[PDB]
Amino acid sequence: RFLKVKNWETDVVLTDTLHLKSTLETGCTEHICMGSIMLPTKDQLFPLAKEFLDQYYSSIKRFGSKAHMDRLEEVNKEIESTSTYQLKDTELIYGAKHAWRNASRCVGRIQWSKLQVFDARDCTTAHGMFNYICNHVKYATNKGNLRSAITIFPQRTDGKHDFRVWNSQLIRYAGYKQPDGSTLGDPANVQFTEICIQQGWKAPRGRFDVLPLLLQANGNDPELFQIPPELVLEVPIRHPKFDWFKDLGLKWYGLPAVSNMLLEIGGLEFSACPFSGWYMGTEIGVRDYCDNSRYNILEEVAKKMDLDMRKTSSLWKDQALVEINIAVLYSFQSDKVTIVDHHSATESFIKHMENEYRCRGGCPADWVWIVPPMSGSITPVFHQEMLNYRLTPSFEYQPDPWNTHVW
Amino acid sequence: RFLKVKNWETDVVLTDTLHLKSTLETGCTEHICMGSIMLPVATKDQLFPLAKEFLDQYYSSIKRFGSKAHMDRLEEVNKEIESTSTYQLKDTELIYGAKHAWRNASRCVGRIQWSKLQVFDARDCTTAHGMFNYICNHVKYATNKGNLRSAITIFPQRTDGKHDFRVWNSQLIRYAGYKQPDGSTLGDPANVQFTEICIQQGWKAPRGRFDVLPLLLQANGNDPELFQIPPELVLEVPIRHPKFDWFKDLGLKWYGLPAVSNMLLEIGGLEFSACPFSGWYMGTEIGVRDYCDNSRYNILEEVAKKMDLDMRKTSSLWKDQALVEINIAVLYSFQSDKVTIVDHHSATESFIKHMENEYRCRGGCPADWVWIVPPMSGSITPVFHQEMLNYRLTPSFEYQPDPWNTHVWKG
Numbered sequence: 001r002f003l004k005v006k007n008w009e010t011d012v013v014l015t016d017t018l019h020l021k022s023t024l025e026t027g028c029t030e031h032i033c034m035g036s037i038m039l040p041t042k043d044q045l046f047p048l049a050k051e052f053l054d055q056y057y058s059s060i061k062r063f064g065s066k067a068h069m070d071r072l073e074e075v076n077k078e079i080e081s082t083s084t085y086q087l088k089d090t091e092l093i094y095g096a097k098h099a100w101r102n103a104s105r106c107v108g109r110i111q112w113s114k115l116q117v118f119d120a121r122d123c124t125t126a127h128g129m130f131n132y133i134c135n136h137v138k139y140a141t142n143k144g145n146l147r148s149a150i151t152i153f154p155q156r157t158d159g160k161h162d163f164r165v166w167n168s169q170l171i172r173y174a175g176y177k178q179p180d181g182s183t184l185g186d187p188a189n190v191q192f193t194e195i196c197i198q199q200g201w202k203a204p205r206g207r208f209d210v211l212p213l214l215l216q217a218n219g220n221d222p223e224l225f226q227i228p229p230e231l232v233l234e235v236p237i238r239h240p241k242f243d244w245f246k247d248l249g250l251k252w253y254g255l256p257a258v259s260n261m262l263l264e265i266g267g268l269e270f271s272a273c274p275f276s277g278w279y280m281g282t283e284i285g286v287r288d289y290c291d292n293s294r295y296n297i298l299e300e301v302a303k304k305m306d307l308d309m310r311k312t313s314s315l316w317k318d319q320a321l322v323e324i325n326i327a328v329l330y331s332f333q334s335d336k337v338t339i340v341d342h343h344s345a346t347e348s349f350i351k352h353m354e355n356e357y358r359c360r361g362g363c364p365a366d367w368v369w370i371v372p373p374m375s376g377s378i379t380p381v382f383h384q385e386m387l388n389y390r391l392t393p394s395f396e397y398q399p400d401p402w403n404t405h406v407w
Numbered sequence: 408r409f410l411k412v413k414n415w416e417t418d419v420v421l422t423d424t425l426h427l428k429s430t431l432e433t434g435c436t437e438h439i440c441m442g443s444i445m446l447p448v449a450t451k452d453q454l455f456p457l458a459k460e461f462l463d464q465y466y467s468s469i470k471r472f473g474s475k476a477h478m479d480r481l482e483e484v485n486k487e488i489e490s491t492s493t494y495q496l497k498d499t500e501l502i503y504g505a506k507h508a509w510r511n512a513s514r515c516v517g518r519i520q521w522s523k524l525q526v527f528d529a530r531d532c533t534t535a536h537g538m539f540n541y542i543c544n545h546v547k548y549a550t551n552k553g554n555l556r557s558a559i560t561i562f563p564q565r566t567d568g569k570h571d572f573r574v575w576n577s578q579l580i581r582y583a584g585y586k587q588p589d590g591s592t593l594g595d596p597a598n599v600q601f602t603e604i605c606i607q608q609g610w611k612a613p614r615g616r617f618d619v620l621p622l623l624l625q626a627n628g629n630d631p632e633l634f635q636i637p638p639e640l641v642l643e644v645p646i647r648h649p650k651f652d653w654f655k656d657l658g659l660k661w662y663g664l665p666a667v668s669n670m671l672l673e674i675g676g677l678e679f680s681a682c683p684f685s686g687w688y689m690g691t692e693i694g695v696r697d698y699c700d701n702s703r704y705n706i707l708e709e710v711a712k713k714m715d716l717d718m719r720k721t722s723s724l725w726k727d728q729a730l731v732e733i734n735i736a737v738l739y740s741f742q743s744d745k746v747t748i749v750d751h752h753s754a755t756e757s758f759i760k761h762m763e764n765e766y767r768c769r770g771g772c773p774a775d776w777v778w779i780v781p782p783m784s785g786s787i788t789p790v791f792h793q794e795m796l797n798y799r800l801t802p803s804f805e806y807q808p809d810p811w812n813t814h815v816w817k818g
């Protein structure tokens with residue numbers, strides 16, 4: 001029941017007791033490991049509420065206190081008639097921060113307690129949503145000195161009155177299929193970009209066209225909105241040594257802001273809850289630029305470096321991937337926009353795991369996601385055993401709204 | 408039940424039904440995943456069932472499931488079990504067994520080659536000296552002047568667990584490590600403890616950065632004895648870089664034959680505690696892990712110095728930058744000496760082909776993503792984008808405790 005993790009580089013051994021307060025299911029059985037799978041009512045809504053308040057009140061050292069009990073009964077009452085309930089602000093803030101704290105795929109959690117939570121539960125329209133979003137973007141960007149935040153729209157009711165942001169991120173680049181079969185911009189968003197044009201977006205059909213936001217309030221048809229360009233901090237990508245780097249025409253946005261997840265607190269479901277932090281250099285440099293079905297610029301970059309592309313074994317893909325990633329970090333630093341490299345982010349997460357083990361008794365962690373997609377073994381998380389388990393409050397994936405919605 | 412895995416790069420979905428033919432637990436539960444944990448005397452009662460399963464498998468693969476020869480083999484094994492409390496695998500069975508252990512090794516990216524594996528039956532061996540001879544002939548055959556060939560050598564199975572054959576080395580060829588007074592290590596820091604044991608056992612250590620350790624061999628439960636592999640049998644490659652001439656001045660070399668010798672081979676209930684096997688290296692094994700792990704030779708710093716890198720700030724990717732050059736240098740030296748080696752791009756691509764084919768013809772390929780994904784440049788290799796299912800099939804290679812921890816000394 002007590003479980004140990006070992007780091008094979010330092011011989012450090014931590015004892016996990018947090019996973020016994022674990023509640024959702026991992027997808028694994030005693031017979032099969034699914035660690036590398038991307039995605040493995042009144043009766044129900046109450047015990048969830050009770051478990052959440054138990055954990056809240058214990059955190060502010062008023063476990064078993066009268067305020068605790070009184071809140072419990074007050075929630076049970078709203079439930080026994082309304083079929084749902086409302087979080088207090090303090091609960092909402094605590095629940096958000098913990099959903100981040102329990103995000104087993106997030107390497108950036110050392111920062112979990114400094115989250116800014118904008119309570120948008122008084123929202124009622126897509127224009128409302130647009131205004132909350134712009135405000136969130138502007139606060140988070142903070143002229144390049146980024147700050148974590150999450151904006152929380154009204155919780156689910158009957159599930160036909162959901163609030164949803166259809167973009168998978170607040171800020172992402174257009175994808176256009178072409179009459180030769182190739183792609184322009186970002187192929188990950190090709191479908192979304194069609195959905196935007198087929199709702200009436202006039203697309204400039206260029207390589208780095210910031211997508212329009214597309215927002216659904218209270219079950220309604222969703223609606224388009226251009227984020228004010230002066231709110232989208234973008235970084236032109238250049239290299240410290242390679243003067244030529246600049247003319248590949250690359251740039252990237254400063255604000256990563258995940259917008260398609262569902263926030264679950266005490267059995268309540270916040271289907272629209274965009275959140276934002278700041279980039280680790282590899283997300284842009286390795287994945288965004290070099291993933292085969294993304295910008296796929298390796299072929300081109302190594303060309304400029306005059307390396308030997310005649311064999312996989314000259315490691316030309318690898319040499320170029322490094323320079324690209326040196327370039328992304330250099331651009332963001334030079335431009336005073338927050339970015340962290342994969343060495344420093346992983347070191348921090350080691351320090352954070354260590355903290356969470358002594359303060360909480362563990363830290364759910366998903367090794368497949370925490371190990372950066374380059375230079376794995378030269379970062380210390382590589383040598384670190386991690387236990388993956390699902391704690392609540394939490395962020396969960398949810399179907400792309402366009403499969404679900406009813407017009 | 409059927410389970411699907413998606414490759415997120417090419418959108419290929421595959422369907423695993425093979426995980427159903429799978430008895431051993433994983434370490435995971437419905438409530439916790441231990442996918443990244445390194446490590447999460449059998450009786451009559453248990454033995455027959457395991458023999459049966461195995462022989463059912465064997466006879467299926469030769470399309471003789473149900474045949475007189477099948478029924479009579481079962482009955483001969485059952486008989487032999489009741490009479491002797493163990494049993495003897497036929498040669499054909501042992502070969503099939505070893506091949507299937509490898510094919511089932513979910514942490515091995517090299518499995519495309521599983522059916523081509525040379526099996527040496529050393530079940531007649533009785534002494535350490537007989538082991539030294541077997542192993543020498545394994546090394547010579549497998550090395551094959553740089554054109555490496557897969558091989559495994561199998562010594563007598565465990566009996567009462569008191570008469571074990573063991574190769575105390577973790578690999579048949581590995582460099583000494585020496586902890587000095589000042590805290591630093593000369594040679595490979597991974598082999599310090601084993602090195603100490605060798606010296607204790609009477610090995611005179613040359614005390615250089617690349618001393619090939621002696622074989623330390625235990626037969627029939629006996630105390631192990633020391634043997635120097637003939638050095639003309641130990642093929643080595645001095646490491647240089649195609650463009651950096653100072654690289655050779657680092658003084659690096661490596662042996663060409665990766666040969667694991669601490670694992671246990673389980674076939675139809677039988678445990679072969681000594682079964683060293685060898686193939687050939689993936690470049691990153693030497694260049695990433697052996698040279699660049701902080702707990703190994705750790706040349707990252709020395710190489711970065713020599714490159715005039717900006718080492719004052721990690722965000723310069725000076726570690727990433729040297730890592731690649733070292734891996735370039737390892738592939739280049741092996742290829743130039745005509746010693747078989749494979750880069751991670753080609754190994755991973757090969758593995759994806761193997762795994763697809765395995766789903767086609769077998770209904771699955773157990774695979775451990777944590778281990779299949781190479782330790783540099785993960786997402787530019789196609790395994791990174793591949794969902795994998797991991798589970799335990801037998802025949803299998805299992806871990807066993809280090810024998811110095813379990814061995815009963817006779818004097």
Ligand code: HEM
Pocket residue numbers: 100103105106107108109111115148149150258261275276277278279280283340345369395
């Ligand atoms: C402060 C800087 C942060 C960094 C550097 C960071 C880093 C990351 C990375 C690298 C991933 C894996 C994504 C990928 O490679 O596709 C990730 C996943 C995730 N992170 Fe963070 N994080 C940060 C802040 C946040 C915040 C503020 C939240 C929420 C409040 C969050 C919640 C999550 C969640 C729920 C996932 C998994 C969802 C997915 O599949 O994308 N992180 N994080």
Ligand code: HEM
Pocket residue numbers: 509512514515516517518520524557558559670684685686687688689692749754778804
């Ligand atoms: C043909 C060339 C081969 C290559 C390139 C290869 C590659 C690898 C690599 C890279 C690993 C992970 C070890 C690490 O990086 O620490 C591994 C694991 C393994 N492979 Fe292979 N392999 C080859 C041949 C073989 C053979 C002949 C066998 C047995 C017949 C085998 C069975 C195994 C086993 C049992 C493991 C687990 C090792 C451990 O857990 O430490 N492979 N393979």
Ligand SMILES: Cc1cc(N)nc(C[C@@H]2CNC[C@H]2OCCNCCc2cccc(F)c2)c1
Pocket residue numbers: 038108256257258275276277278279280283287
């Ligand atoms: C808040 C925050 C900060 C930060 N630095 N980083 C993040 C990760 C974003 C979230 N989500 C992907 C990452 O951005 C990378 C974009 N690639 C998409 C990966 C993908 C494709 C298809 C299916 C999937 F399940 C996942 C969030």
Ligand SMILES: Cc1cc(N)nc(C[C@@H]2CNC[C@H]2OCCNCCc2cccc(F)c2)c1
Pocket residue numbers: 445446517665666667684685686687688689692806
């Ligand atoms: C036959 C063959 C060919 C090849 N290319 N590569 C190999 C991998 C060897 C096996 N064994 C690891 C690799 O050699 C590296 C040694 N590291 C030991 C890994 C380890 C450490 C602590 C706990 C564990 F559970 C496991 C075999």
Ligand SMILES: C[C@H](O)[C@H](O)[C@H]1CNc2nc(N)[nH]c(=O)c2N1
Pocket residue numbers: 035036037038368369370415791792793794795
């Ligand atoms: C197949 C595998 O699950 C998939 O490629 C995962 C692996 N690790 C990842 N890790 C991060 N950080 N982000 C990802 O998108 C992925 N993809």
Ligand SMILES: C[C@H](O)[C@H](O)[C@H]1CNc2nc(N)[nH]c(=O)c2N1
Pocket residue numbers: 008382383384385386442443444445777778779
């Ligand atoms: C903690 C973690 O499981 C451990 O460091 C693993 C990760 N992946 C690995 N992968 C390979 N090929 N070889 C290894 O030794 C390891 N080590």
Ligand SMILES: [Zn+2]
Pocket residue numbers: 028032033034035435439440441442
């Ligand atoms: Zn698992």
